[PDB]
Amino acid sequence: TGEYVPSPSEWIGNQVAQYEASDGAEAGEFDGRPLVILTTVGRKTGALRKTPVMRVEHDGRYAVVASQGGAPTHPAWYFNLVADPRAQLRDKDAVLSVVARELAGPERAEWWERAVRAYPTYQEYQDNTRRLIPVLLLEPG
Numbered sequence: 001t002g003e004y005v006p007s008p009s010e011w012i013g014n015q016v017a018q019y020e021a022s023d024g025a026e027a028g029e030f031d032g033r034p035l036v037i038l039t040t041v042g043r044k045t046g047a048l049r050k051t052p053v054m055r056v057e058h059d060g061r062y063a064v065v066a067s068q069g070g071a072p073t074h075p076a077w078y079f080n081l082v083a084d085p086r087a088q089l090r091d092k093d094a095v096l097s098v099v100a101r102e103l104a105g106p107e108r109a110e111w112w113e114r115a116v117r118a119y120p121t122y123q124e125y126q127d128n129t130r131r132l133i134p135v136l137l138l139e140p141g
């Protein structure tokens, strides 16, 4: 409870670790594009959970996209946000307290365009799912 428990994936855990140790100077990009670290509260364990995701930024808001590399199912961090939308978003040296809001309609469309601009592969994922990919807006706390 309130304790960070890393992803069981050694590679993900290791990427979170290097990013935090270096303010994103290490492990700060994937596919040549910037990452941020999302911290959520585990809805079952109360553990703090930390997840690298693509950076998608505008006016101090961040959108996070629950694509899980084009996996069929939602990732755990998505359920965590639905249970408690409070999160931390680390972008390099800045650590923001934010609250998540899942997007729909024209607002979603706007951030989806921003997300695909940032990481075109997201469109490939959506094309390959019949389920709408969750896009959550992280707003300043």
Ligand SMILES: C[C@H](OP(=O)(O)OC[C@@H](O)[C@@H](O)[C@@H](O)Cn1c2nc(=O)[nH]c(=O)c-2cc2ccc(O)cc21)C(=O)N[C@@H](CCC(=O)N[C@@H](CCC(=O)O)C(=O)O)C(=O)O
Residues within 6 Å of the ligand: 006, 007, 008, 009, 012, 015, 030, 035, 041, 042, 043, 044, 045, 046, 047, 049, 051, 052, 053, 054, 065, 066, 067, 068, 069, 074, 075, 076, 077, 078, 079, 080
């Ligand atoms: C593997 C799983 O992680 P996850 O939360 O499902 O997240 C899956 C992935 O999205 C996560 O690995 C992302 O970091 C992958 N990922 C991206 N994932 C994305 O979805 N979008 C991205 O843009 C993205 C970019 C990215 C860039 C670099 C990189 O290295 C990884 C990237 C996990 O940690 N499972 C834990 C539990 C985690 C958890 O939060 N448990 C909750 C309960 C959750 C529940 O109720 O089911 C708790 O503790 O209470 C476990 O099995 O022990």
